[PDB]
Amino acid sequence: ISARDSVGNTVLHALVEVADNTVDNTKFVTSMYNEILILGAKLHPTLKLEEITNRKGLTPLALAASSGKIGVLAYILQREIHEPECRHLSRKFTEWAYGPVHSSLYDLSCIDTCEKNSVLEVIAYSSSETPNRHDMLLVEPLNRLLQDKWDRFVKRIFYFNFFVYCLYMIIFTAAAYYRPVEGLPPYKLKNTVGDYFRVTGEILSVSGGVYFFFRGIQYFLQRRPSLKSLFVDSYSEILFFVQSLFMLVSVVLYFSQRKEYVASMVFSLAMGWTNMLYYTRGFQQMGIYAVMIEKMILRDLCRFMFVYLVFLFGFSTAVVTLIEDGNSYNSLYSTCLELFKFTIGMGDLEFTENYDFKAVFIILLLAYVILTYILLLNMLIALMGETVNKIAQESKNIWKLQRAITILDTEKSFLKCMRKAFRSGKLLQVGFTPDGKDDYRWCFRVDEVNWTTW
Amino acid sequence: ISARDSVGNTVLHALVEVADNTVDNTKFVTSMYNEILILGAKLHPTLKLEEITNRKGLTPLALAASSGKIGVLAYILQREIHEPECRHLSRKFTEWAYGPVHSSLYDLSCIDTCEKNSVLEVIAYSSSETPNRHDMLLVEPLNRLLQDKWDRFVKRIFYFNFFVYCLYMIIFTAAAYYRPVEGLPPYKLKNTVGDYFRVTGEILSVSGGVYFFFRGIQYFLQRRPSLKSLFVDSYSEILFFVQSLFMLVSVVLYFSQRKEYVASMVFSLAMGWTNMLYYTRGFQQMGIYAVMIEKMILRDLCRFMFVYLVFLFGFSTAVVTLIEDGNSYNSLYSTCLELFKFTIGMGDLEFTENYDFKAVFIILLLAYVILTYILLLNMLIALMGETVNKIAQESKNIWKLQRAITILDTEKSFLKCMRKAFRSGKLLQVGFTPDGKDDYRWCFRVDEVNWTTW
Amino acid sequence: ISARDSVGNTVLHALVEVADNTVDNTKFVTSMYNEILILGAKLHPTLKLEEITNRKGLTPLALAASSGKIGVLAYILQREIHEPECRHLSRKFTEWAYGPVHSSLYDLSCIDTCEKNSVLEVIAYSSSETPNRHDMLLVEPLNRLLQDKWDRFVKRIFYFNFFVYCLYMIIFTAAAYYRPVEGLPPYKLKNTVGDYFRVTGEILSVSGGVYFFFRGIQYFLQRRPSLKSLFVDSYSEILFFVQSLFMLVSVVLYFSQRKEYVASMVFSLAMGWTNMLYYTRGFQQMGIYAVMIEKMILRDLCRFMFVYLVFLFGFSTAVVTLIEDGNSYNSLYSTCLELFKFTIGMGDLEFTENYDFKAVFIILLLAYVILTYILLLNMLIALMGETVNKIAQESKNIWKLQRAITILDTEKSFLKCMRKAFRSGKLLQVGFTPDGKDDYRWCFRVDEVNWTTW
Amino acid sequence: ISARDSVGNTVLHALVEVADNTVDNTKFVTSMYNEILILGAKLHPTLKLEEITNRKGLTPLALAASSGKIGVLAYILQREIHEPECRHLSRKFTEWAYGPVHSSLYDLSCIDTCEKNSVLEVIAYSSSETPNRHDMLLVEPLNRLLQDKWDRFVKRIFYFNFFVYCLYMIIFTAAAYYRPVEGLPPYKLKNTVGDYFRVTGEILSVSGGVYFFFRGIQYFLQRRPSLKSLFVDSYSEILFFVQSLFMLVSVVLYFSQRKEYVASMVFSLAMGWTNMLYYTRGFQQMGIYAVMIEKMILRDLCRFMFVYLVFLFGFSTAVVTLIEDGNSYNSLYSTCLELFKFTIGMGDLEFTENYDFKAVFIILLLAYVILTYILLLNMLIALMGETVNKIAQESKNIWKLQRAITILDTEKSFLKCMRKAFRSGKLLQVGFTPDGKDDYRWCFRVDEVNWTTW
């Protein structure tokens, strides 16, 4: 029963690799897993079948979590076995019942603190290849465990980080606003107190930038994201890293006596403020709003802007060719800009007279207006409405993932401050092992009231 | 059966405190209440079990109404007991039936005029802690009772108050429009007739302001609203009070020879006109429209404006920093205003040339335009659509609450004019008490036709 | 069985007055009507029970049609009685069946040509008091009968009228465009050919105007609409009449040597062109579009414009009061206009500097912008979306009514050209009356294929 | 059983002509077809009943495909007959089953390569008279066959054509941008290298134009589209042809020494760029987007623009008539343009003062603004939203059709390069004909896993 194949998969691992998350498949695989587990316990009480690992080091539970098999994962996490001969195999227990009320216990053996591959760590840190990682956290124990971790200690840390980032952005804004304008950099210091404050702000800004640089580096090293996972998943890390890059380039140009550094700085500044939006994930409504913003950017703007740019460039080339210029609108950039103005409600239908045929010019402009302003923009609004109607629940699930990742990252960072002081659940005696010893587990109690059962 | 616990709750009070408004819980609690009531009546006909009150003075009916237990409340209000031995316990009666037609009577023992805690008074005057106070008024007797009170006498009073407020606002507008401009206040009177009219208008405006001041004071004293209930529920009272405050401050500044009083006055003026919207609750369609307006303000604008202000401030700081100024757009206020203009369709992409790098400026502006004008605003429209699709019935229920509160407040104010002349239902003989005396109750007849029963 | 009450209602009339269009009520009343009819036919074959009329002259069928009882009407129109003893009472017949195919006949006794109160005439010419007159025409015979009348002869007449109105509007436009400008009216004629054409156009325009005047008069006389039905139902008749009134007033002023006549004329002109939209009811898609336009105007614009005008007037009064003027924006009309400009995307936030406090002015303007431009307009778009989602089928039904009214009016007008040449259905022998004579009826054949029955 | 009627239809053809795609009709016709086929095979094994063709040359399968009978077509393509006596009549086979897995084979006898009327060719090349040609391709074999053809060889060809068209458009743009401006055409050549490049670009542009001209010609000849099918179906072919026409006219005018050629050229240029959108059908998301664009143009813009133009012309005539002009706004074109500006957010409410009555002018303008800007445009947005909600699946199906047509056209064009090298499926032995010989067919294998059957 403990035999391993070439890859190291055991019968349990094989069942897990089989499942495709179909209802019939899920029921059949769960039944087969339960039967095999019970039979093995009857045959070999001493041996542990779930502890066995494949060549990759993944247990059946971790394998199901990594592979996206929500049905098998849900079955395992909530497994209950009422057989007196083998109750140790179950993960879910009823501590007591006061009639309508009931108190249950969950195991957390490798949900939270498992040394190598914790299930939570595995789900949050996935690469999106899995079909459904958003719905995985919805199972009963994980959701409540994460919320407990959030309400206990991570919320205050997140709020502190948000406050610090706000301060940093304010310092950067003030320092950039009062930059010197006379001469070339670097600028000589003065005994003026305001100059000392300005220099202090500059130094703090640079320090924050290099800090974000190194944090992005360590994220890349630690998470070893794939190229796709780099493009599709880690948007915030990339944005913060790019902001830091702009700052560092600004420093380089500043000490290289070039004046272009301002450019870099301003971009960084702008992006910084936008990146404040990252902190909307500590709040449910605003986090869901920001998820919606992300989805709209990815889908609707991308499509609309492809088409709009095609049309704009075509009509701009036509208009510029028509123009003779015999002021100076005979430029592609100027004409593209003048036609873009129609989109923000500031279009002049008479922005030049340097042409030989007025009807052609007018016709082209009105075709452009009808195609972009009256059709494409309102069409975009419609599509946004459809998408909003569609992504009500996916946005909440993605927000829950984002918060979970935040929780895990914070909990890792503050190992030194508290390695195991903030540990979830409590150590409780559950029963007796068939060997006769006590059974002590790190359980997570839940209270549930059922009127129907009585 | 009449025994009381430490808090004073009786078995009925305990059942009421138990209910959570679940279907199974509701059915079980209603059955238990009916069984206990019948058994008690059989055991102790003389004693009254519902009259007993807890330490707080709340009866089971008032307790259910206050706590938001719609199921128990609905059961009690429409209780019918066909047992010949105990029919007095029922609240709903059939006066007669002409075949398809039937005439029923409701009791109104403490629905309307109950001295201490009337159920209507209790529901309307709630603090929103209850899960569902909007659906409570939907029960059969209360809805029809409120509509009868509205159609009988309160509608004319509401219309009169609306007319008077319109006149007041017109007087205030005319008086403010023709204010003196030469010198400092106070302004010396003249024998000109127009000046007498102006002074008359000023005095009437001040009187209205102080009246609203005192009305807000008495509302606060009487309703003793909690801090939350002050923030979340009493928007109109706050708005009228603030308008009065602006007027009073204007008077103070006017007699203090300061010229700033105009500022205060205009704000009051503006708010006054907006507060006219409060009178859309006498009309169903417009009241529901105004409820929708409230909800949109609370949710969609708040979220949108958070995000929009973040983006605007960031890009404004970036643009201002880029600007050198070597007119005078090198100000944060001016740049924020110029960028806000893009939002109302009046943005100039060439509002300054005092910069060293044009590409940076152009890129920043177009990023701002794409992020706010093309994404956020249309996104907002989409979200408004979703919300509208969602709040069709909640808005009607909230309007019904607003009208109910108006009815109760009016009915209280005009006690002197008619303490009990306008009382709902009529005194009718229903049957005979088990003691053999007549049973006289203030009943509210209803007519209902049922073809199925025959 | 033929006895009449004080109002003249017979048992059938009484049943009809009973029905409330509930499913149980409908089934029970239909069953009772059928039983009473069969029993009466058995008792008194010679007498006719449906022919009997109440004091008002309305038969049970016409009474049901007028009162809005769709269930009873549908039962009567499609009544089939397979009893050999009494088959004459049925209105629907099967001429033959070729297996899957079947051919049915409908009676049309008083659906189309009934002298006093034809059912079609009665439904189309209703006053909207009936709960559902839109769904009435959906019954099987009436829909197909109306479509036959449309496809046979009325479509060409409608197209001809549309062409003539287009010509009239073109003549009016051309004549008004080339009006004289030198002096006061009336203008002396000239031998110039263009002047003769201009005068011809003027005369034709006046003739069309007086024609529409008299047509509106005769409509009012004939239809005797109630005050409500005048306000709520006959929009097109009112609009055409008002256009004619403007034209006639223009003539009066023109021969009264006043120059103001132009004003009147232009209004008429404008309304004329808009009234061309009336001819979108000959086409399904455009007719439904125009119905939607009507509904939006009635509901969404009305509500929005109430609120918007309140806000605009309030903020305009505030701004005007703030202004000192020590150009000349110190007018209520100018300020209201400048603030309305914000709504069409042309608002200037710096349209005056004649004030003492800039912060107050700016704050007021931005409050106005946020309340009207960012909330109310987008809110309106959302509400329009909800309404569109709601009125998909009602618009089609209302279009069908509009077309039906057009058909009836046309068919009445052209009695002289063809009194009975264009009559629907054909005279066919159906069977034998119990007296033994032939049964000849004006039937309307239909073909229907049913695979299930076989 | 093989007897033919006057038109040549056999009993199978008659059944096919009978079907109306109703569920009961579909089941009954499929059962009758199967019974007749089995009985005929039992009676006449040697004869082939499906091979028989009507006078038009269409077999029952091709007849069903052409006529739009999706039910019969689906039955035939997936027919399975497990009777040992006659298994040859079936089209769908199970090669093997490994438990949960199964491998099926489809016949492709005349789905792909049938000489005269291939089913795929027939469905793609339809004239839209059929009720549902979009859903036809959804059947199991055709969808997978088309996707295989796409993934195998046509995708690269499509990408190559897209690249070539992009290059052509770039060459045309560059050549047109640098056109000579001094004198009249034709322009004398110069030894300047840039002039040689310009001439090369001109020649290549003309060659592309004449190529598209001839391709449109051959399409018209080959497909022999009907007048309707020309108006309703072949939009892209028409657009490319019109672009070529503009180019050719430009050449004609250029060598005719006329200067107007530029006009033609620019139009062609513009349309060229827009026609790049045709290549969005190689990508699913963008193809569906472009289908939505098409539908919106056809429905919503058409209706909106009818109504909007009516209103604009009416109010423009009114305003122009009011104007006296005693600059020069007394023109219909200028006034129509100024009023259209209100639509793109650039309307001036004070664009002239040459009138005698200001109130009339203001009233007309505000009526126009309210009717077009506040009602019609937002109404349009709402309608777009409804349409988007409605056409989610139809757009995907139409995209699949467009891609299928592209596949077929490409596969026809490259017959010379590979007549039968790229043929779908493979030749496999299926069984034995009743004559005892082998049965070899061009089958298309599919793999399907079913857990329920086991």
Side-chain angles (χ1 to χ4, degrees), chain A residues 143-151 153-181 183-187 189-191 193-259:
Chain A
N143 215 24
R144 314 190 84 129
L145 189 142
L146 285 176
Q147 184 73 351
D148 171 46
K149 282 188 176 186
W150 173 260
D151 297 328
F153 69 107
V154 175
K155 186 210 293 180
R156 283 319 313 190
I157 301 180
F158 187 81
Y159 287 14
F160 177 71
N161 283 336
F162 185 10
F163 173 81
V164 170
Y165 187 72
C166 286
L167 283 182
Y168 165 73
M169 291 317 316
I170 292 177
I171 301 301
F172 183 12
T173 298
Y177 188 89
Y178 290 107
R179 56 175 185 99
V181 290
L184 284 181
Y187 299 106
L189 199 47
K190 293 181 177 33
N191 295 334
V193 70
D195 283 89
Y196 287 89
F197 279 179
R198 188 184 55 75
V199 169
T200 293
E202 278 154 273
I203 292 172
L204 296 188
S205 307
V206 174
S207 66
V210 57
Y211 168 89
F212 281 123
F213 183 74
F214 285 132
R215 275 217 57 186
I217 288 296
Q218 83 181 359
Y219 162 90
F220 171 87
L221 295 191
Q222 286 182 295
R223 293 282 290 275
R224 289 292 181 170
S226 70
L227 187 66
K228 293 308 172 183
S229 158
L230 203 62
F231 274 42
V232 180
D233 288 316
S234 51
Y235 294 118
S236 47
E237 285 291 27
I238 286 160
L239 290 176
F240 278 82
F241 189 61
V242 176
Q243 179 203 342
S244 64
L245 281 188
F246 270 121
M247 172 63 81
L248 294 186
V249 172
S250 171
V251 174
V252 162
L253 280 163
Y254 173 93
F255 279 119
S256 178
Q257 287 166 353
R258 297 323 307 283
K259 186 68 177 180

Side-chain angles (χ1 to χ4, degrees), chain B residues 99-101 449-451 454, chain C residues 9-16 18-19 21 25-26 28-30 32-33 60 63-64 67-72:
Chain B
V101 188
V449 189
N450 188 311
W451 295 95
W454 264 125
Chain C
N9 285 13
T10 306
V11 58
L12 303 179
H13 294 143
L15 286 168
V16 167
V18 169
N21 313 338
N25 186 317
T26 288
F28 183 64
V29 176
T30 49
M32 294 177 71
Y33 194 112
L63 181 69
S67 290
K69 311 290 169 51
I70 177 166
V72 180

Side-chain angles (χ1 to χ4, degrees), chain C residues 179 333 340 343 345-346 451 454, chain D residues 18 25 28 321 345 362 366 373:
Chain C
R179 55 175 186 99
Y333 163 79
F340 172 76
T343 294
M346 282 286 278
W451 295 95
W454 264 125
Chain D
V18 169
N25 186 317
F28 183 64
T321 310
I362 297 300
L366 289 124
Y373 186 80

Side-chain angles (χ1 to χ4, degrees), chain D residues 352-399:
Chain D
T352 192
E353 281 166 330
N354 307 330
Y355 50 67
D356 285 0
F357 316 106
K358 182 164 185 192
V360 184
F361 183 82
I362 297 300
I363 289 169
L364 285 170
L365 285 185
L366 289 124
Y368 173 75
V369 163
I370 291 161
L371 278 175
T372 61
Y373 186 80
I374 293 173
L375 174 74
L376 273 181
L377 269 173
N378 305 332
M379 175 149 193
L380 170 72
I381 299 166
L383 294 171
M384 300 180 134
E386 189 54 42
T387 298
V388 164
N389 187 11
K390 276 183 145 157
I391 66 179
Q393 185 56 27
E394 190 198 2
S395 296
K396 185 151 188 205
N397 295 347
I398 297 175
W399 167 66

Side-chain angles (χ1 to χ4, degrees), chain A residues 173 176-177 179 273 292 345 384, chain B residues 314 317 320-322 345 357 378-379:
Chain A
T173 298
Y177 188 89
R179 56 175 185 99
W273 278 109
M292 286 160 149
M384 300 180 134
Chain B
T317 46
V320 172
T321 310
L322 188 71
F357 316 106
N378 305 332
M379 175 149 193

